Design a protein around this motif. Structure first.
Motif, PDB file in Angstrom:
ATOM      1  N   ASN A  82       0.809  -1.247   0.000  1.00 20.72           N
ATOM      2  CA  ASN A  82       0.000   0.000   0.000  1.00 20.72           C
ATOM      3  C   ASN A  82       0.857   1.321   0.000  1.00 20.72           C
ATOM      4  O   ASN A  82       0.563   2.289   0.702  1.00 20.72           O
ATOM      5  N   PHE A  83       1.922   1.342  -0.797  1.00 20.80           N
ATOM      6  CA  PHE A  83       2.723   2.533  -1.057  1.00 20.80           C
ATOM      7  C   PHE A  83       1.899   3.505  -1.922  1.00 20.80           C
ATOM      8  O   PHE A  83       0.926   3.113  -2.408  1.00 20.80           O
ATOM      9  N   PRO A  84       2.246   4.809  -2.032  1.00 18.16           N
ATOM     10  CA  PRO A  84       3.293   5.643  -1.376  1.00 18.16           C
ATOM     11  C   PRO A  84       2.811   5.918   0.029  1.00 18.16           C
ATOM     12  O   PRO A  84       1.644   5.906   0.210  1.00 18.16           O
ATOM     13  N   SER A  85       3.672   6.050   1.022  1.00 16.28           N
ATOM     14  CA  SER A  85       3.234   6.587   2.307  1.00 16.28           C
ATOM     15  C   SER A  85       3.896   7.928   2.454  1.00 16.28           C
ATOM     16  O   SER A  85       5.135   8.091   2.255  1.00 16.28           O
ATOM     17  N   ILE A  86       3.088   8.915   2.819  1.00 17.24           N
ATOM     18  CA  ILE A  86       3.607  10.279   2.901  1.00 17.24           C
ATOM     19  C   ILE A  86       3.532  10.837   4.354  1.00 17.24           C
ATOM     20  O   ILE A  86       2.509  10.707   4.953  1.00 17.24           O
ATOM     21  N   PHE A  87       4.667  11.332   4.893  1.00 19.33           N
ATOM     22  CA  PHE A  87       4.867  11.786   6.290  1.00 19.33           C
ATOM     23  C   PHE A  87       5.349  13.206   6.352  1.00 19.33           C
ATOM     24  O   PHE A  87       6.025  13.658   5.466  1.00 19.33           O
ATOM     25  N   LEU A  88       4.926  13.941   7.357  1.00 17.14           N
ATOM     26  CA  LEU A  88       5.440  15.290   7.577  1.00 17.14           C
ATOM     27  C   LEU A  88       6.154  15.309   8.927  1.00 17.14           C
ATOM     28  O   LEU A  88       5.661  14.731   9.952  1.00 17.14           O
ATOM     29  N   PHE A  89       7.327  15.932   8.936  1.00 19.18           N
ATOM     30  CA  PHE A  89       8.074  16.137  10.183  1.00 19.18           C
ATOM     31  C   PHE A  89       8.316  17.568  10.433  1.00 19.18           C
ATOM     32  O   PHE A  89       8.384  18.424   9.481  1.00 19.18           O
ATOM     33  N   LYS A  90       8.484  17.826  11.724  1.00 17.62           N
ATOM     34  CA  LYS A  90       8.831  19.136  12.208  1.00 17.62           C
ATOM     35  C   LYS A  90      10.163  19.132  12.919  1.00 17.62           C
ATOM     36  O   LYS A  90      10.214  19.648  14.030  1.00 17.62           O
ATOM     37  N   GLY A  91      11.232  18.606  12.296  1.00 23.55           N
ATOM     38  CA  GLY A  91      12.522  18.733  12.925  1.00 23.55           C
ATOM     39  C   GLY A  91      12.788  17.661  13.953  1.00 23.55           C
ATOM     40  O   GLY A  91      13.850  17.655  14.546  1.00 23.55           O
ATOM     41  N   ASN A  92      11.818  16.749  14.143  1.00 23.46           N
ATOM     42  CA  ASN A  92      11.951  15.543  15.083  1.00 23.46           C
ATOM     43  C   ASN A  92      11.552  14.157  14.423  1.00 23.46           C
ATOM     44  O   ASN A  92      10.385  13.901  14.078  1.00 23.46           O
ATOM     45  N   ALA A  93      12.520  13.265  14.212  1.00 22.50           N
ATOM     46  CA  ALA A  93      12.238  12.124  13.311  1.00 22.50           C
ATOM     47  C   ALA A  93      11.370  11.146  14.117  1.00 22.50           C
ATOM     48  O   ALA A  93      10.776  10.194  13.566  1.00 22.50           O
ATOM     49  N   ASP A  94      11.292  11.406  15.438  1.00 24.74           N
ATOM     50  CA  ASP A  94      10.426  10.655  16.275  1.00 24.74           C
ATOM     51  C   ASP A  94       8.993  11.208  16.344  1.00 24.74           C
ATOM     52  O   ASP A  94       8.164  10.621  16.948  1.00 24.74           O
ATOM     53  N   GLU A  95       8.647  12.311  15.755  1.00 25.27           N
ATOM     54  CA  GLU A  95       7.276  12.680  15.894  1.00 25.27           C
ATOM     55  C   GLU A  95       6.825  13.079  14.530  1.00 25.27           C
ATOM     56  O   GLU A  95       7.412  14.035  13.967  1.00 25.27           O
ATOM     57  N   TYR A  96       5.805  12.399  13.990  1.00 21.68           N
ATOM     58  CA  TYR A  96       5.412  12.655  12.564  1.00 21.68           C
ATOM     59  C   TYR A  96       3.874  12.684  12.479  1.00 21.68           C
ATOM     60  O   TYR A  96       3.088  12.219  13.465  1.00 21.68           O
TER      61      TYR A  96
END
Length: 231
Positions: A82-96
């Motif tokens: 089930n690709f593409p998966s799209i993520f947004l980060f704010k400068g922390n790779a642990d919180e998306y």
């Protein structure tokens, strides 16, 4: 691997995501072809035009061979089936934040994913998001509310950093003050003047400054005029 999209892997993902204040990352197969890929690509280019603060990145995930970026994929619970998966980060790779999987992958939803979840804005040159937020139905609000918004946006203008951006903001306020003074006829009037300006001999830079004014003036349009005055 789309134009403008940095290609990331297990050694470089977290270090690079975390040097940018905002990142949008597509997890996907290695070697994406198709309409979902062509739109990311289009969003990459539009994003690069609107901002310098945003990482646009890609993670290609494999399972023949040595499964590159399988680990990284799982780190984010990404559905290989089930690709593409799209993520947004704010400068922390642990919180998306994840684009929900039921959202179609279009230019315009990609832009809306960013606007909804960050301070950033990918739209028409000359616009300023915190100004658009207070300005919906400007034309129709009471005189006293209109002037209190003038106080407010004048506050915001004073603390603005980019030469360009200071100037976008002077146009917003000139228009807010004129609509307040003359009412909604000022739109038809200003629009006619700017287009005539733009129909002249101008330099590309003057052109682009004329599009930013028309873009900003566009924010003041209302479907229906609901304020009138007198006789």
């Amino acid at each position: 691997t789309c134009t403008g999209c940095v290609d990331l892997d297990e050694l470089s993902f977290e270090k690079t995501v975390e040097r940018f204040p905002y990142s949008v990352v597509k997890f996907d197969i290695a070697y994406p072809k198709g309409e979902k890929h062509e739109a990311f690509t289009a969003f990459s280019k539009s994003a690069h035009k609107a901002t310098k603060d945003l990482l646009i990145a890609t993670v290609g995930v494999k399972d023949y061979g040595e499964l590159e970026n399988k680990a990284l994929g799982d780190r984010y619970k990404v559905d290989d089936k089930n690709f593409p998966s799209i993520f947004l980060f704010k400068g922390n790779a642990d919180e998306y934040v994840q684009l929900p999987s039921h959202v179609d992958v279009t230019l315009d939803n990609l832009k809306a994913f960013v606007s909804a979840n960050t301070p950033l804005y990918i739209g028409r040159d000359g616009c300023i998001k915190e100004f658009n937020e207070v300005l919906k139905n400007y034309a129709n609000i009471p005189d006293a509310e209109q002037l209190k918004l003038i106080e407010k946006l004048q506050a915001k203008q004073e603390q603005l950093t980019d030469p360009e951006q200071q100037q976008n903001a002077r146009a917003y306020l000139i228009y807010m003050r004129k609509i307040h003074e003359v009412g909604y006829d000022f739109l038809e009037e200003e629009t006619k003047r700017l287009l005539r300006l733009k129909a002249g001999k101008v330099t590309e830079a003057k052109k682009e400054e004329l599009l930013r004014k028309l873009n900003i003036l566009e924010v003041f349009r209302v479907h229906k005029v609901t304020k009138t005055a007198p006789e």
